Design a protein around this ligand. Structure first.
Ligand SMILES: OC[C@H]1O[C@H](O[C@H]2[C@@H](O)[C@H](O)[C@@H](CO)O[C@@H]2O)[C@@H](O)[C@@H](O)[C@@H]1O
Ligand SMILES: OC[C@H]1O[C@H](O)[C@@H](O)[C@@H](O)[C@@H]1O
Lengths: 218, 211, 218, 213
């Protein structure tokens, strides 16, 4: 029996990119126009893209034109769908489908379909950080923890840029949650912990978030 | 070209002869196909060029029409035929579908029995509060659940799931889970789920007070 | 200047699949062998895969052979890398790089590289569910909440299969965390809440996890 | 298969120096050898190929020599822009293979890390997550090891680390390690400690705190 199988689905943040692929069993794709179709949550089907034999014609639904790309690999029998700038309404089950019939003509229905791969686009394309103090215990260390933001980057200054000496802002780490986190620290004279106020200025331009956190002994 | 199917939901009895219609915004000659699709499965081609039955498809399926008006007829519904049906205009390098028709077993209207469950202490000690609302054995399928916390309409923090038609009584059931961190959950007192449904003359609310 | 840009990186669970693509600016790929290379966390580069002109040969590193596939689309100038059965040690920055030079010769270096896309493979390929009781507050309803598991499916029975009437086990939902969650409920006579014991048997074959939870009034 | 080995793995030098990086092939590769520069988070850039051909536009202080199994990249007069990783590569008709990379860094004296431990802020803890942070400040060279212990129990798998580039004024490195725990798990134990080793320390350094004190 003819078979198709999609790979590559999953969760995507709005604005992100995801690439799907389709492989086959028991036929060769080269004689067929290949298609992507999606089943939206309301239940209906939406044609997404088509690629003719020899890739002579590539066609897209109006809703994805300029964001999606379809390619074919006739020698190892794969079809690809690049999805860029993804939107909430791209959320759907994506199928690869062969255009064909028992007897090929210039315009055939979709006679063979893969089982589908789920693609889910979350609505937030950005997220501002939470900012927590790293409280100081002759030299003391203090800082700010900038946690759970997306995407990069974040900038950190101290005392609106007046405190630069001794400052280290670390590279962000990608947490297992898919959110970024970084720390910014500074060492200062221990005697100043009583008099001087220390404020870290965290700016996250993607989410248009600014946070000023005062760090003081606990 | 825009394809419009009707009805969106068709309720019928086993053995019935039913028709599904598809209308095209402009003439498409006989370039029309019909697919069946079961939940979570792939579409299956039934008919193409308006009336040609795909080999192996049972003879109780048939299609007709040309130009702008097309019909799929199922002559003697069997249990296996309750499913969604899709029409499709197909051209050389593009296609477009109708919105689909869900064919279900008809029964009398049945209002949901509503139950709300607070988070278990165990889960709550881990830092997460799942509050679950259950709509049990209702018909037809359309139901609406709204969560309110201290009379505050929630949005974006719940997910729903619905069963297929029960094999014995042809009803549906629905579960809605409102998820909140232990911290946010302890910020409010009254948790309530509000249900509307064709079988309810006014919305039904089930609630509990935290603690 | 010639340019390349990779798309499609992100977080993957061990055993999962991810597909990358590469598009270009200011040259045509058809005359070039195209390559994928990765920079591993220790800092070194590892050649991953290549595809010759006309796709005469597709070559793979020993570590990825049988799991990765490279394809080329000479008409719209894209290269693809399918990555399947992914392993923690596939975690890296992935670059597309063309074999070429100021004057193409029989054997050239990699003269143009994309900026790279980050691919992160988490070690857990499965995760067993937490099972929480849905406590019964005529007819009463009770159940079990089967939360945070991966991948599907989970099966649920009640009282080892002796209680079937009135049971609804719902389709799982994909949570925003990428973990699945489903609830199984049953309606029973309120009079049986004092005497009859109700146990939901949750089985998660992928992680070989079994849980028996007794559901009782609060 | 051809294996390429670079020497040294880390090369420490001063601005203006002339330095050499060596690359060895496990079998003869004639002159099919290329050298790339790469800065953190950036793409590799081709410097030299066929062992000694400078890519057009690459500054003349870079040069390469060698054939067979022994190759060298020479940088005659290091500028600040040249502190980076350098990679050698054997490239054949269908595949290529790289050395392990050589990091060229600014040389300074050995400096032991100054270690600091931070408990989670109460604010973060009330949201249900506890991030415990360990700071290793201003050490050199870059290799250091940090381990977390909770109630004297060696932890495994619940921490992430990141390291700065060489400080612009004193050329040291700094490192942060974050141990992440749910509020529930964090309130289950008392003593939180990070333990540090570095060649500049004669014995491990431990910083700890007691939850709530
Ligand atoms: O999308 C049009 C058409 O494309 C594919 O068939 C092509 C070729 O392989 C066939 O031999 C001829 C027959 O007329 O048509 C095309 O050139 C198939 O996908 C076909 O089913 C489809 O209608
Ligand atoms: O692999 C041999 C040869 O293949 C292509 O022509 C290009 O990639 C060249 O740069 C390379 O030298």
């Amino acid at each position: 029996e003819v078979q198709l199988v999609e790979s590559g689905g999953g969760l995507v943040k709005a604005g992100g990119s995801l690439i799907l692929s389709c492989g086959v069993s028991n036929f060769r794709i080269s004689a067929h126009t290949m298609n992507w179709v999606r089943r939206v949550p309301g239940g209906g089907l939406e044609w997404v893209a088509s690629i003719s034999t020899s890739s002579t014609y590539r066609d897209y639904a109006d809703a994805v034109k300029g964001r999606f790309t379809v390619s074919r690999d006739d020698l190892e029998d794969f079809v690809y769908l690049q999805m860029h700038k993804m939107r909430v309404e791209d959320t759907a089950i994506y199928y690869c489908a062969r255009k064909g019939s028992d007897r090929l003509s210039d315009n055939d229905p979709f006679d063979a379909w893969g089982p589908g791969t789920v693609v889910t686009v979350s609505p937030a394309s950005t997220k501002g950080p939470s900012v927590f103090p790293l409280a100081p215990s002759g030299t003391a260390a203090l800082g700010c923890l900038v946690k759970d933001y997306f995407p990069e980057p974040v900038t950190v200054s101290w005392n609106s840029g007046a405190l630069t000496s001794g400052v280290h802002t670390f590279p962000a780490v990608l947490q297992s949650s898919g959110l970024y986190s970084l720390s910014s620290v500074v060492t200062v004279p221990s005697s100043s912990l009583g008099t001087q106020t220390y404020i870290c200025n965290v700016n996250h331009k993607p989410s248009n978030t600014k946070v000023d956190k005062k760090v003081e002994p606990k | 070209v825009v394809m419009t199917q009707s009805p969106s939901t068709l309720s019928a009895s086993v053995g019935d002869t039913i028709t599904i219609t598809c209308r095209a915004s402009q003439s498409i000659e006989t370039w029309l196909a019909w697919y069946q699709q079961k939940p979570g499965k792939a579409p299956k081609l039934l008919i193409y060029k308006a009336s040609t039955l795909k080999t192996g498809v049972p003879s109780r399926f048939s299609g007709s029409g040309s130009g702008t008006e097309f019909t799929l007829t199922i002559s003697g519904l069997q249990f296996d035929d309750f499913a969604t049906y899709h029409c499709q205009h197909y051209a050389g390098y593009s296609a477009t579908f109708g919105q689909g028709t869900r064919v279900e077993i008809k029964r009398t209207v049945a209002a949901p029995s509503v139950f709300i469950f607070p988070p278990s202490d165990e889960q709550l000690k881990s830092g997460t509060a799942s509050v679950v609302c259950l709509l049990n054995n209702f018909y037809p399928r359309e139901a609406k659940v709204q969560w309110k916390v201290d009379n505050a309409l929630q949005s974006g923090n719940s997910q729903e799931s619905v069963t297929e038609q029960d094999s014995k009584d042809s009803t549906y059931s629905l579960s809605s889970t409102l998820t909140l961190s232990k911290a946010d959950y302890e910020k409010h007192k009254v948790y309530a789920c509000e249900v509307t449904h064709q079988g309810l003359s006014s919305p039904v609310t089930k609630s509990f007070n935290r603690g």
